[PDB]
Amino acid sequence: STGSATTTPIDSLDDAYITPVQIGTPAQTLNLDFDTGSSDLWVFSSETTASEVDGQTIYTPSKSTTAKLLSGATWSISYGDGSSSSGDVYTDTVSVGGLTVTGQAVESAKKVSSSFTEDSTIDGLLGLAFSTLNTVSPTQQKTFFDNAKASLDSPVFTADLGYHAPGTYNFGFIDTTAYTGSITYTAVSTKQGFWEWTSTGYAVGSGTFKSTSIDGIADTGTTLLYLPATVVSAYWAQVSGAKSSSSVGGYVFPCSATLPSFTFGVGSARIVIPGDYIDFGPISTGSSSCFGGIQSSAGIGINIFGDVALKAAFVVFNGATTPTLGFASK
Numbered sequence: 001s002t003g004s005a006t007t008t009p010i011d012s013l014d015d016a017y018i019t020p021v022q023i024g025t026p027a028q029t030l031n032l033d034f035d036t037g038s039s040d041l042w043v044f045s046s047e048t049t050a051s052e053v054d055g056q057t058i059y060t061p062s063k064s065t066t067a068k069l070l071s072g073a074t075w076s077i078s079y080g081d082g083s084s085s086s087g088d089v090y091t092d093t094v095s096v097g098g099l100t101v102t103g104q105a106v107e108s109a110k111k112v113s114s115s116f117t118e119d120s121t122i123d124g125l126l127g128l129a130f131s132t133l134n135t136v137s138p139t140q141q142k143t144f145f146d147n148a149k150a151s152l153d154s155p156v157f158t159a160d161l162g163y164h165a166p167g168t169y170n171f172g173f174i175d176t177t178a179y180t181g182s183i184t185y186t187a188v189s190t191k192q193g194f195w196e197w198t199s200t201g202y203a204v205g206s207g208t209f210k211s212t213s214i215d216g217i218a219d220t221g222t223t224l225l226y227l228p229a230t231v232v233s234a235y236w237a238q239v240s241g242a243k244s245s246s247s248v249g250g251y252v253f254p255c256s257a258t259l260p261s262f263t264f265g266v267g268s269a270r271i272v273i274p275g276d277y278i279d280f281g282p283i284s285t286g287s288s289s290c291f292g293g294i295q296s297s298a299g300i301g302i303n304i305f306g307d308v309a310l311k312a313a314f315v316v317f318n319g320a321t322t323p324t325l326g327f328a329s330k
Contacts, residue, residue, distance in 0.1 A: 001099055001100075001148070001151045001152060001153065001172055002098070002099060002152065002153055002170070002171060002172035002173045003095075003096045003097035003098045003099025003148075003169075003170070003171040003172065004097040004098065004168060004169075004170045004171070005019050005020060005021075005096050005097030005168070005169050005170075006019070006020075006097075006166050006167070006168055007019040007034060007161065007162075007166065007167050007168060007169050008166045009162065009164065009165070009166070010119070010121040010122065011121070012164070012281075013280050013281055014161075014162075014163065014164060014223070014307060014311065015223055015280075016033050016119075016121075016122060016221075016223060016307075017033065017034065017161060017167070017220070017307070018031035018032065018033060018121060018122060018123075019031065019032055019033075019034050019096070019126070019169055020032075021094060021095070021096055021126060022093075022094065022095040022096075023043065023059050023064070023092055023093070023094050023106055024059065024061070024063070024064030024065075024066060024067055024092050024093060025064055025065045025066040025092075025093055026064075027095070028057075028059055028060065028063070028064065029057070030043055030044070030057050030058075030059060030123035030124055031057065031121065031122065031123045032122070032123060032124045032125060032126040033122050033124070033125045033126070033221060034125075034126050034128055034159075034169055034220055034221070035125050035126065035127050035128060035129070035219070035220055035221030036128040036129055036159070036194075036195055036217075036218055036219055036220045036221065036317060037080075037127075037129055037194060037195075037217060037219035037220070037221045037222060037304070038077065038079065038125060038127040038129055038133060038221060039127040039128075039129045039130060039131055039132070039133040039134040039135075039143050039193065040075060040077050040107050040125065040127045040134055040135055040136070041094070041104065041105065041106060041107060041124070041125065041126045041127055041143065041144055042075065042077070042085055042087070042106075042107035042108070042109055042124050042125055043058070043059040043106060043107070043108060043109065043123060043124035044056040044057065044058045044059065044109055044112070044116075044123050044124055045058050045059040045060065045061065045087070045108040045109055046058055046059070046060040046061065046062065047061075047087060047088070047108050047109070047110050048087070048108075048109045048110060048111070048112060049110065049111055049112075052111065052112050052114075052116075052117045053117065054117050054118065054120055055120030055121075056120060056122070056123045057123045058123070059106065059108065059123075059124075061090045061092070061106075061108065064092055066092050066093045066102075067090045067091070067092045067106075068090060068091050068092070069088070069089075069090055070088075070089040070090060070091055070105065070136075070139075070141075072138065073088060073089040073105075073136050073137065073138070073139060073141075074086070074087070074088055074089070074136070074137055075087060075088070075089060075107045075135045075136045075137070076135055077135045079221075080222070080300065080304075081115070081222075082113075082115075083113045083115040083116055084111075084112075084113045085109045085111060085112040085113065085116060086109065086110060086111050087107060087108045087109040087110035087111065088107075088108055088110065089105055089106070089107050089108065089136055089141070090105075090106045090108055091103045091104060091105055091106065092104060092106045094106065094144060096126075096144065096169070096171065097169065097170075097171065099148055099152075099171050099172065101144055101147045101148050103147070104144055104147055105134075105136060105141035105142070107136065107141075109124070125221065126144055127143050127144075128143060128144070128145050128157065128220070128317065129143070129193055129194055129195065130143075130146075130190050130193045130194070130195075131143050131146045132190070132193045133193035133194075145157055145171070145317075145319060146319075148171060148172070149319055151172075152171060152172030152173075153172045153173055154172055154173060154174070155172075155318070155319045155320050156171075156172065156173070156174065156316055156317060156318050156319060156320075157169060157170060157171045157172070157317050157319070158170045158174060158175070158178075158314065158315060158316050158317065159220055159310055159314075159315040159317065160175075160178050160179075160314050160315070160330070161220070161307055161310055161311035162311060163274075163276070163277055163311050163312075167311070174316060178314050178330065179313075179314035179328035179329065179330040180328065180329050180330055181328060181329055182269075182328065183314070183316055183326040183327065183328040184266045184267050184268070184269035184326065184327055184328070185267075185316070185318070185324045185325065185326045186198070186266050186267055186324065186325050186326070186327070187324060188318075188323045188324050188325055190323060192217075192302075194217040194218075194219070194302075195217055195218040195219075195317060195323070195325055196215065196216070196217050197215075197216070197217075197218065197325050198213050198214065198215050198216075199213070199214040199215075199216060199264050199265050199266065199305070200212075200213065200214075200265030200266065200267060200268070201213075201214070201264070201265040202214070202227075202231055202262065202263060202264050202265065203262070203263040203270075204234055204235050204238050204260055204261075204262060204263075205238055205260030205261055205262075205275075206260075207238075209263065209265070209270070210234075211265070214227065214228065214231070214264075214303055215302075215303060216297075216302065216303030216304055216305050217302060217303070217304055217305065218305050218310060218315060218317070218325055219304050219305065219306050219310075220306075220307060220310060221306075222304045222306030222307065223280075223293075223306055223307050223308065224280070224292075224293050224294065224295050224304075224306050224307070224308050225262075225273070225278075225293060225294045225295070225304070225305060225306055225308040225309045226295050226296065226297035226300055226302075226303055226304040226306065227294065227295075227296070227297055227303050228296070228297060228298070228303065229296045229297075229298045232251065232294055232295060232296045235260070235262055235294050236251050236253065236292065236294070238260050239253045239254075239257050239259060239260070240254070240257065241253060241254040241257070242254075242257070242292070244296070248283050248289070248291065250291065250292060250295040250296070251291075251292035251294070251295060251296075252283055252289045252290060252291055252292060253289070253290050253292055254288065254289065254290065255281075255282060255287070255288045255289065255290040256288070257290075258275065259275030259276065259278045259279055260275050261273055261274050261275050262275075262278065262294060264305070264309060266327040269327065271309070271312050271313045271327055271329060272312060272329070273308060273309060273312040274312070277293060277308055277311065277312060278292060278293035278294055278308060279293065280292065280293050293308040294308065312329075313327045313328060313329065313330065314327070314328040314329075314330045315327055316328075
């Protein structure tokens, strides 16, 4: 089997992407944030504290004839941006782009933190990291991909995120029309539960390529590109006026700038992030100071190839026995 679903930016900055997901019988369609950096599928629901729901579409298990409480199971998760959610667990039928998993753990939120409440466009998350990170207790649960894997034509999914435009998540096949040139595959470590790989280096604008190993994770659920302070300093040094602002919370730059591109290495291949991808607009409405899309990972504890990087590529998440990652230009 295969599935194919369109993923759509939630706003004009590509702050996140939502993908429609069918849950239950009859289908309840919720728009979920596909997150290769976590491993819980959780949803706003009829169980979510009412004051913490503000415009989201909710999953109502009692209206699904295929929903079953997973007795005793609870979940609770905190993300790298400080947001969090928790609740209990159902199993139900979940379909993504025509691909159907029965008995999928659907984690029903009883509580969500304010950033989730305040984002009316995101109805929940669909985790696509390794199931070892799943937070369901006392019985850890499998991701949607893990559950679907054996039924897929090929044990892969691909992320084709758009710049200011819709893109695609495909399951079970590689769309050879969706990229240019060839796909370069690179090794993955699953030791931390992430799609963790080592970039072979970087260049800033038309600058010479610096060969250097950068360990990081391919994370569709993170908006920006977080890299070592040395790298990030070298990038922003090429933008007149750019500076790190502790009060704003990272590198800012004059909105009048033309940003240089940023290239990262995948083995011998190179992915080029156009400078426009790195512009996240005024720090506050009407400001002429703009927020940078490349930020330091110092104090995160890991480098993160988030949407800013991933949207510049066609990305293959290969979940074969030995997982790998593939990157192509597009």
